[PDB]
Amino acid sequence: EQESVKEFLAKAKEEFLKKWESPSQNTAQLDHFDRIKTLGTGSFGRVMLVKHKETGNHYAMKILDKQKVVKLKQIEHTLNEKRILQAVNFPFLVKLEFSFKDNSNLYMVMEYVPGGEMFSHLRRIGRFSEPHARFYAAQIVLTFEYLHSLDLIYRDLKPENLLIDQQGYIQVTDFGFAKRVKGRTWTLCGTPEYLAPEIILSKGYNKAVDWWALGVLIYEMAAGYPPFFADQPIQIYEKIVSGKVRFPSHFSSDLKDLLRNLLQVDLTKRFGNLKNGVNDIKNHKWFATTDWIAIYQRKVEAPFIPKFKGPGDTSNFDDYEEEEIRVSINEKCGKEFTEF
């Protein structure tokens, strides 16, 4: 690697480790914000558009119910998510602006990206052209180069987690499964269509699972559907482990070749996990047109800019039942979340 890249990553790791070792805590409180709209909901939390009452700035506030986190055995994951997010700094990672907790919930207040999820845009457009898919893929390659150099595995790559910003660039959101790992880790987590074979087979796995997921993402962006799908998870998993994938005839030869090397079932042969690391991907002919520095510097004109009216526009998000943000009179699960 050019010494310029080595020195960049050395400084990135220094800055990450300082924040990792002394995390920020308790940097706002709930009544500093007005609630605007629910942007998404899950089994133990929700994301809400909020507005800071003094500055007027909009944010996306992720709210996690401590009791449901415990019940659903996500304590370590939630602590991972916040400790990682408060420590990272990269152009294609969403910025955590505040965090805090109260008697009932954990809160992560992030920059609000009004353009919405890539998944919605992909399903609306149908499929992305190879140049368009390549523009997004390059950002993920650089983001994983950064995260992996910090010993971080992301473990939830999929278009739903990739927000499209006001310049048409990606912001990765949702670090709920991200983890600092030296060597191997074992947790079953992810999304079925995106799981690498070694996760399905219950092995000790490493950052190679993120490169597998990049193959899935590039395939889904360029085809409009993922490479392994079926009605039931077990049928998806059978396809993943089989070592067979079929490509649409419209895929270029270079795209097919890259994908065979990312969707390589043998992790010891998978691009991104070889002696040359990320450079086997960056130097592949499918990326021959990519100016890696210009992507990092956000100098490339994007394939499209989402349509939105301003920083508070929610048109690119869908509609959910608006439920209370209840805070108990009594502290719940204090011990489990002391470090948050």
Swiss-Prot record:
Modification Phosphotyrosine occurs at: Y320
Entry-annotated residues carrying Phosphoserine: S129, S328
Catalytic reaction equation(s): L-seryl-[protein] + ATP = O-phospho-L-seryl-[protein] + ADP + H(+); L-threonyl-[protein] + ATP = O-phospho-L-threonyl-[protein] + ADP + H(+)
Entry binding sites for ATP: 39-47, 62, 111-117, 158-161
Protein name: cAMP-dependent protein kinase catalytic subunit alpha
Compartment list: Cytoplasm; Cell membrane; Membrane; Nucleus
GO terms for cellular component: acrosomal vesicle; axoneme; cAMP-dependent protein kinase complex; centrosome; ciliary base; cytoplasm; cytosol; glutamatergic synapse
Family, as annotated: Belongs to the protein kinase superfamily. AGC Ser/Thr protein kinase family. cAMP subfamily.
Keyword Lipid biosynthesis among UniProt keywords: no
UniProtKB keywords: ATP-binding, cAMP, Cell membrane, Cytoplasm, Kinase, Lipoprotein, Membrane, Mitochondrion, Myristate, Nucleotide-binding, Nucleus, Phosphoprotein, Serine/threonine-protein kinase, Transferase
E.C. numbers: 2.7.11.11
Species the sequence originates in: Cricetulus griseus
Gene: PRKACA
